[PDB]
Design an enzyme around this catalytic site. Structure first.
Site, PDB file in Angstrom:
ATOM      1  N   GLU A  77       0.855  -1.169   0.000  1.00 19.77           N
ATOM      2  CA  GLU A  77       0.000   0.000   0.000  1.00 19.77           C
ATOM      3  C   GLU A  77       0.892   1.220   0.000  1.00 19.77           C
ATOM      4  O   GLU A  77       1.852   1.304   0.765  1.00 19.77           O
ATOM      5  CB  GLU A  77      -0.896   0.026   1.236  1.00 19.77           C
ATOM      6  N   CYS A 118      -5.723   5.011   6.211  1.00 16.76           N
ATOM      7  CA  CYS A 118      -5.540   3.857   5.343  1.00 16.76           C
ATOM      8  C   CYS A 118      -6.786   3.024   5.117  1.00 16.76           C
ATOM      9  O   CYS A 118      -7.511   2.712   6.062  1.00 16.76           O
ATOM     10  CB  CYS A 118      -4.457   2.960   5.918  1.00 16.76           C
ATOM     11  N   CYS A 154      -5.685  -1.294   5.714  1.00 19.26           N
ATOM     12  CA  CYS A 154      -5.984  -1.622   7.099  1.00 19.26           C
ATOM     13  C   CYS A 154      -7.124  -0.756   7.616  1.00 19.26           C
ATOM     14  O   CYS A 154      -7.049  -0.146   8.684  1.00 19.26           O
ATOM     15  CB  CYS A 154      -4.759  -1.485   7.989  1.00 19.26           C
ATOM     16  N   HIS A 157      -7.422   2.252  12.396  1.00 16.19           N
ATOM     17  CA  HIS A 157      -7.262   3.619  12.885  1.00 16.19           C
ATOM     18  C   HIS A 157      -8.544   4.131  13.507  1.00 16.19           C
ATOM     19  O   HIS A 157      -8.512   4.930  14.433  1.00 16.19           O
ATOM     20  CB  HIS A 157      -6.784   4.542  11.765  1.00 16.19           C
ATOM     21  N   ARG A 165      -0.432  -5.261  10.892  1.00 16.84           N
ATOM     22  CA  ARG A 165       0.999  -5.046  10.707  1.00 16.84           C
ATOM     23  C   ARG A 165       1.752  -4.765  12.008  1.00 16.84           C
ATOM     24  O   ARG A 165       2.965  -4.558  11.995  1.00 16.84           O
ATOM     25  CB  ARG A 165       1.238  -3.936   9.685  1.00 16.84           C
ATOM     26  N   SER A 218       3.779   0.351  10.489  1.00 19.50           N
ATOM     27  CA  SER A 218       4.753   0.530   9.415  1.00 19.50           C
ATOM     28  C   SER A 218       5.675   1.724   9.685  1.00 19.50           C
ATOM     29  O   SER A 218       6.759   1.820   9.106  1.00 19.50           O
ATOM     30  CB  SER A 218       4.068   0.637   8.055  1.00 19.50           C
ATOM     31  N   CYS A 228       2.865  -0.650   4.509  1.00 23.09           N
ATOM     32  CA  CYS A 228       1.752   0.214   4.194  1.00 23.09           C
ATOM     33  C   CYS A 228       2.208   1.636   4.440  1.00 23.09           C
ATOM     34  O   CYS A 228       2.312   2.078   5.589  1.00 23.09           O
ATOM     35  CB  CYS A 228       0.568  -0.112   5.077  1.00 23.09           C
ATOM     36  N   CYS A 275      -0.210   4.319   5.931  1.00 25.12           N
ATOM     37  CA  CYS A 275      -0.074   4.129   7.369  1.00 25.12           C
ATOM     38  C   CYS A 275       1.214   4.719   7.933  1.00 25.12           C
ATOM     39  O   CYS A 275       1.184   5.446   8.931  1.00 25.12           O
ATOM     40  CB  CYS A 275      -0.141   2.645   7.707  1.00 25.12           C
TER      41      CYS A 275
END
Ligand code: SF4
Ligand code: SF4
Ligand code: SF4
Ligand code: SF4
Ligand code: F3S
Ligand code: F3S
Ligand SMILES: [Mg+2]
Ligand SMILES: [Mg+2]
Ligand code: NA
Ligand code: NA
Lengths: 269, 551, 551, 269
Positions: free
Chosen positions: B13, B60, B63, B67, B478, B501, B545, B548
């Site tokens: 991503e 994002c 994912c 968040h 992640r 990430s 990502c 992210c």
């Protein structure tokens, strides 16, 4: 037989618009990429990377000049000469302008590409703007939503493929089959609104009876879309209001990401 | 001496650039760079704390959900809110189902083509491929006839002359080590994976209101109205629908994904011997099951020096040991303030200076835990669970290793988990264990509703004056995610996200020490500097990502 | 001589009783009896002609759609209405998709357990079962692993002691002739069939508004609003969704259903040599494709003396030869008026006198065609198509025979089609041919909309005075259906339905000639008079529907 | 492990109510009969026939006395001593009364069993009545519709199995989760009704824009149900009004099969 080419460029995106394709059912993503179109460039799915994938893009832009559908996902940042989004060492705006030159049709998918979206909200740290602002001389088809139902995109592409022209568009260049009516003007909770039957807090009696969500901040009265009818994910009965949460107006410039969740639709402060 | 650049890195991503110095054909130094910034932390400033989650969820869409839940947890932390247990069950089901979709897509759609050669699949004998899996898996879609249908799809694609997203891949690359039959098996599973991940997202949609980007959360709980006898709300019919999709996930996860993980390991054993990103690992506990934001199904913790005996458990989202250790620095990132900052004091002021190898070279900040670099993610979470002596994690790992041993006659030791394949194994183990979480939490919800508890929401009291600080932790696909909110006079005065990430892809830190991606690449051989497949393999193992990482 | 009764006959629609005299172990004489009546013809009387279809659709929910379409066709006939071609495409797609669901459910859920022994499937070796289909079918769900999962489902059901609908079936009956492996194959396909029929009905639902019982028809056309650019109507997105389900049907039909038909025939050769119900056959042409209620995709016609060289084509639903021939007699049915009646002058006056072998014994009337007893249904429609030298029909039949040959080393001649298995083969052939109808009619709709035609409905004029007669023909899943309406002074003054199962299940007629069910049973061997499986096999081959037969 | 027993008796039925099970997805019919319940008697699906299936009925009544859910589909004809529906040589009314005595719960599925339905319309040739009329002393759960969405039935059975009691019922003994609201009081075309935006004929401009179907004869204003929300077939957007045809009132006694398709709501005849 040959499949129509599509070039997909990601600017300031969260990848939600690409991810929406993974929920699609008509066509599914696998039938899309193997049977319906030739996805010539997409950074999320491409086997090739680095020098090879840019080679794919150049090859595609030349080979299919005048025939590809260009899709842009994400906002374009104008502040500080475009440096807030650089791919292969170049501002994304330059990639977009070059690709737009030979496009048969150009689609802005998602609210970010359509009008700036969440990236352009608040103080707008990167000077993010929508695609039309970057390509003033071009006809852009806008498919807003964060993300839109993938079929709002797929049926638009299908219309171009099958009948050789874009679908009918409104004054904001949004396809009328998907954005031609306010959500509130085709919402199943309208009888509750009319009667004065409103949820006032999550978990209250009215909320637990499926009453209208206006007084929780529903932006349906000022948002164009098909969320109440087409809904999401093709399982039946799934959209934010049906689940119990007000529409936030994510389709609509100046509503989504601007108005508070619980700010009322008639309140403009 | 010889420098190569990979920009863009695909099948991740977001926007990632990787650079490597190559000495004697091997990577000797590396740089990871996030090349797009939006300023999501600034965009959410000065708003009602209740609004944040709808905005920052847009960090994002891969994912998605993560968040959103971290943000409401942060506001709930600041305001001292106990989330109703029904809201926990719903949040947990959403997160577990999402993560199932996420891991499956990562292994197949994002990663498999690093290891799988589709042109070699064209040469396979589908009968031979099918026979290979005899006694290896009980999956019902491994017939020669299924593999023939898949092989014909590949044939048609190639014959059309429009390979599209499959064009110019590393077909025929020396590092591709699968026999034709195993390449064909993998492509068949790649396609089958698309159906499984769709079912996982149908669970997410039925509770979330849609996906990507769920819309059923609230500071104080969830927006789902629980009423078994209600029309148009979350009733028994809707719950049954949710259960029907939950029940469709386990077979693929256990009989295909788990198995393919061991098969890849079997043909690529040297990838258990490279790709270590760190010696320190950190994970947050996840899936609270009480009415006081605790009693997690999964433990978290901190491990140092690649030594499981150092394990320090973390079983609370208000553990001060965890909270107080976290800082970020922009010494090598494009921001103005360069000294390490704790996130409640964090700033995000852009200072773009262009890419340089010894200066600032990324939009990703460099996080540290007590001044040290740490790897987060499924490898970290697996190692923490093994150290905690969690029987289910040991058993699931042992299952994968058993298949590997059947194929190779060799075993896998804990030391070998600190590697590219170990990371991938950790992810598979996580996905397997999440199926039990889904069943357990669905059942808990049904039982609690039967006890007469339909409560889903408690209204926040947000004081018009005073300052309040909160942090929301979440163990994302992640790794450890944390959102940090400061509220002053009723509105958000500061907001900082430190994303998994960010930890893994972060540039050199305040002490000039490399991050996990950058460290993992040192030692990697490169067969073709023009097509550095070996670099991409290791980087993909972290599941990058960049939306992210940078936000 | 022993007399037996089968009451109720199960795995049909509705209420059927069959009686048989047995001499020297063979059926010598039989009686078929419909045991439930509702009086649907009387219920619909004195109403506006436009209202009839919603009421008479409720004659039957198994063959839902059929009475609905036949009813509007009857009113359109009476009122001289030309149906818009778009409405024909939509009606055709609905009927074809419904019939696909109907035939699949009949072969598996209704009929298979006459020929398949589920207890025997427990003894099967799943690997051997998979192996025997090698080269027989390209279907992707015939693996040993799939068959093992299925065998375990049967095993768990049996182990529970709660066999439910599978309890006390003809398990171990001497006329059960499949090997354990083939029983297991059939049970696996019975389960797989349920998903395919669901997809067929999703096509029906998207155009009909729901199923069972569609709600999109009108005298004058359909209620679907065609607007490619409209929100909430039949637009391109909705059409794409319809197409996605149409596309999912063909593989199961061709690679499972078509194959299993040949498999069953392979193990039951003598069933190609018994079960003939008639020497005369009737079918209506079906799927009109012009704007004048004609240009049918499927031909119809009349065959006598079981001889295709007698074939008389019927190519119009206004054919006076067909119309004038049809009569019904209640001599042996529980109604008052016994002389043969043309349906426009028909009556339905109940006269229940109880069972009498030589008198009245059924609520089903006895239809005749110019005095002849006639079989209707997929065998009739297949024979007419073969006689017309329809290439697609010959081709599909030949494909079934080729599979049969692979299994047995035998072939099937047209003479052998006048039998229990021939009837089943006709149904399978029909289902196969319908898949091309679905593709053709969907494409025709897309093309026509592209030419700018969005017309779906023409509003009828119902004259306030005067008498008008109409007849609506439809080739239904079970054969030729006809609805006969007389309108007088703007309302329905007579309504008579002559339904396919009325023709086949009808009792002895005015001259005491037995109906097709009754004839078909003569000669049937009976192993166990208390468990007359052989009788049930032949009766089921006609796909009885008694709510249809009696209405 | 054992499964809850169900005995299903068909009276004057068209089999549509059984057919609805073949459209269900949660549970599918295969998961229903193998996992959720033990379907001890059902003539449409039973392997046994004649004497053997009647043996099954008797054995199940005896083995599960006090435990089974009795489901009746179809109306019961009282005229002429029950001869308009005879099974195994006995009027269906006797089969039903026999089975009702030992039932743990009794459900009338479909409008026919609920209130007489289409079979009792017009002059009512057979003296057809609903189940409650046949069993005046018993509590009957009514699940009307012709046929109802199968999950209206399945979720009712699930409530009984899971929580040990029926779902909440309205004054007509219909589960409130499915029948607690008028269709018109939760219909997405209500905004059009409010604005006077009405289709007047199939295929007209308003019809082709998805306007309200009141003046086409929609019985939503006088019919209780969940057709506009739960809809049908679980594909999303499928119910009669969404497809373009007015509600006929099939759920509701005195509406469906009594009133003309194009007769307006509240108009008698
Ligand atoms: S629109 Fe919403 S979803 Fe699509 S990219 Fe912009 S943010 Fe991600
Ligand atoms: S305010 Fe929102 S919930 Fe209420 S009727 Fe309008 S759109 Fe529907
Ligand atoms: S209710 Fe409608 S569908 Fe169910 S049986 Fe009576 S008629 Fe057939
Ligand atoms: S009349 Fe019918 S279509 Fe119009 S709003 Fe009411 S229920 Fe909906
Ligand atoms: S928030 Fe967006 S998804 Fe639809 S319901 Fe509102 S426009
Ligand atoms: S006719 Fe029946 S199915 Fe619903 S829409 Fe009206 S109650
Ligand atoms: Mg941050
Ligand atoms: Mg009749
Ligand atoms: Na290796
Ligand atoms: Na035989």
């Amino acid at each position: 037989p040959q499949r129509p080419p599509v070039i997909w460029i990601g600017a300031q995106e969260c990848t939600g618009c690409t991810e929406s394709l993974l929920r699609a059912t008509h066509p599914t993503v696998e039938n899309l990429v193997l049977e319906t179109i030739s996805l010539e460039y997409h950074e999320v799915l491409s086997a090739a990377f680095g020098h090879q994938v840019e080679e794919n893009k150049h090859n595609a832009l030349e080979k299919y000049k005048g025939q590809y559908v260009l899709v842009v996902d994400g906002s374009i940042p104008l502040k500080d000469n475009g440096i807030y989004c650089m791919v292969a060492g170049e501002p994304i705006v330059d990639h977009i302008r070059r690709a737009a030159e030979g496009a048969a049709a150009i689609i802005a998918i998602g609210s970010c590409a359509a009008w700036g979206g969440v990236a352009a909200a608040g103080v707008n740290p990167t000077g993010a703007v929508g695609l039309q602002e970057v390509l003033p001389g071009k006809t852009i088809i806008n498919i807003p939503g964060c993300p839109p139902n993938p079929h709002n995109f797929l049926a638009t592409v299908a219309h171009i493929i099958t009948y050789g022209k874009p679908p009918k568009l409104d004054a904001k260049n949004r396809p009328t089959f998907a954005y031609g009516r306010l959500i509130h003007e085709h919402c199943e909770r309208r009888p509750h609104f009319d009667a004065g039957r409103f949820a006032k807090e999550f978990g209250d009696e009215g909320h637990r009876e499926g009453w209208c969500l206006y007084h929780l901040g529903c932006k349906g009265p000022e948002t164009y879309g098909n969320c109440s009818t087409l809904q999401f994910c093709d399982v039946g009965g799934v959209w934010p209001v049906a689940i119990g949460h007000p529409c936030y107006g994510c389709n609509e410039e100046g509503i989504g990401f601007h108005k508070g969740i619980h700010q009322l639709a008639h309140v403009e402060n | 001496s010889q420098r190569i650049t990979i920009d863009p890195v695909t099948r991740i991503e977001g926007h990632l650039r990787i650079d490597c110095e190559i000495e004697n054909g091997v990577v000797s130094k590396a740089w990871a760079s996030g090349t797009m910034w939006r300023g999501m932390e600034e965009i959410v400033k000065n708003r009602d704390p209740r609004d944040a989650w709808m905005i920052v969820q847009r960090i994002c869409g891969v994912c998605t959900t993560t968040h959103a839940i971290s943000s409401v947890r942060a506001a709930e932390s600041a305001l001292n809110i106990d989330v109703p247990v029904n809201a926990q069950y719903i949040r947990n089901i959403i997160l577990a189902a999402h993560t199932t979709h996420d891991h499956i897509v990562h292994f197949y759609q994002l990663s498999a083509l690093d290891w799988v050669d589709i042109t070699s699949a064209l040469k396979a004998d589908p009968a031979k491929a099918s026979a290979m899996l005899n006694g290896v898996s009980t999956w019902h879609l491994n017939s020669a006839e299924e593999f023939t249908k898949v092989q014909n799809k590949i044939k048609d694609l190639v014959a059309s002359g429009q390979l599209g997203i499959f064009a110019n891949g590393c077909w025929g690359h020396p590092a591709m080590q699968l026999p034709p039959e195993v390449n064909l098996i993998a492509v068949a599973h790649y396609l089958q994976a698309l159906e499984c991940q769709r079912d996982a997202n149908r669970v997410v949609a039925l509770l979330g209101g849609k996906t990507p980007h769920i819309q059923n959360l609230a500071v104080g709980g969830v927006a789902n109205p629980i009423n078994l006898d209600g029309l148009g709300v979350l009733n028994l019919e809707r719950l049954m629908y949710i259960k029907s999709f939950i029940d469709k996930l386990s077979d693929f996860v256990e009989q295909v994904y788990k198995v393919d993980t061991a098969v890849i390991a079997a043909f690529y054993p040297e990838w258990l011997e490279r790709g270590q990103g760190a010696v320190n690992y950190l994970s947050a506990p996840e899936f609270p099951t009480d009415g006081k934001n605790g009693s997690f199904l999964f433990p978290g913790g901190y491990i140092t020096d690649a030594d499981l005996s150092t394990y320090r458990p973390i079983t609370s989202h208000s553990d001060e040991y965890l909270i107080k250790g976290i800082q970020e620095s922009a010494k090598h990132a494009w921001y103005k303030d360069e000294a390490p900052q704790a996130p409640w004091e964090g700033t995000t002021v852009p200072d773009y200076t262009g890419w340089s190898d010894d200066g600032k070279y990324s939009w990703v900040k460099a996080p540290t835990f007590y001044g040290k670099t740490v790897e987060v993610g499924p490898l970290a979470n697996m190692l923490c669970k093994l150290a905690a002596k969690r029987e289910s994690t040991h058993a699931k790992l042992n299952e994968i290793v058993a298949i590997y041993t059947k194929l190779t006659g060799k075993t896998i030791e804990v030391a070998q988990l600190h590697s590219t394949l170990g990371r991938i194994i950790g992810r598979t183990v996580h996905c397997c264990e999440l199926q039990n979480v889904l069943q357990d939490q669905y059942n808990a919800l049904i039982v609690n509703i039967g006890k007469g508890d339909h409560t889903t929401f408690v209204k926040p009291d947000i004081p018009a004056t005073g300052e309040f600080k909160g942090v929301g932790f979440l163990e994302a696909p992640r790794g450890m995610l944390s959102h940090w909110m400061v509220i002053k006079d009723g509105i958000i005065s500061n907001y900082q996200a430190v994303v998994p990430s960010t930890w893994n892809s972060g540039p050199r830190n305040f002490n000039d020490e490399v991050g996990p991606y950058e460290r993992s690449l040192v030692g990697t051989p490169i067969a073709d500097p023009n097509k550095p497949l070996e670099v991409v393999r290791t980087i993909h193992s972290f599941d990058p990502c960049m939306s992210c990482a940078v936000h």
